Ligand binder design. Structure first.
Ligand SMILES: [Cl-]
Ligand SMILES: [Cl-]
Length: 162
């Protein structure tokens, strides 16, 4: 298992514009286009992102290109983040993937707010951090996925995904 496979499982693949769980225009593998209610805004955003006249649809290759870009952006964001970098450096490989997953989903900024969970991951207090993470909107809105990421943190294995 690896991050890509991991996220592929959590986000799915869709070649046509679609709305996320929060109602936002998205495409490919979890690629948020816009928070705006307009499909046009979304459509515009999309074309700008592919570099072509898409019409709300993309190819698989296009979806993967975007995905590669996003994961890379995420790793770089964490490494660049004063609050995230240390947590990250402090972790093992599997758990690192779990932090990347959250960041991909909620942004550096949203993850950075899990001040408490973070301190706990840093101290290697697995069960405690798991419970703390569970006390969140995140958990309450996307429980299954949340649970998958959380187990990953608690155990350090890919069991949740197998
Ligand atoms: Cl809560
Ligand atoms: Cl879910």
């Amino acid at each position: 298992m690896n991050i890509f496979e991991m996220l592929r499982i959590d986000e799915g693949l869709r070649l046509k514009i679609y709305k996320d769980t929060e109602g936002y225009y998205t495409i490919g593998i979890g690629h948020l286009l816009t928070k705006s209610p307009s499909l046009n805004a979304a459509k515009s955003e999309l074309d700008k992102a592919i570099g072509r006249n898409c019409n709300g649809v993309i190819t698989k290759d296009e979806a993967e290109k975007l995905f590669n870009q996003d994961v890379d952006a995420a790793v770089r964001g964490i490494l660049r983040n004063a609050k995230l970098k240390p947590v990250y450096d402090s972790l093992d490989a599997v758990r690192r993937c779990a932090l990347i997953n959250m960041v991909f989903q909620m942004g550096e900024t949203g993850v950075a707010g899990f001040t408490n969970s973070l301190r706990m991951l840093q101290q290697k207090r697995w069960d405690e951090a798991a419970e703390n993470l569970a006390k969140s909107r995140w958990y309450n809105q996307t429980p299954n996925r949340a649970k998958r990421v959380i187990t990953t943190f608690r155990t350090g294995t890919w069991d949740a995904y197998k």
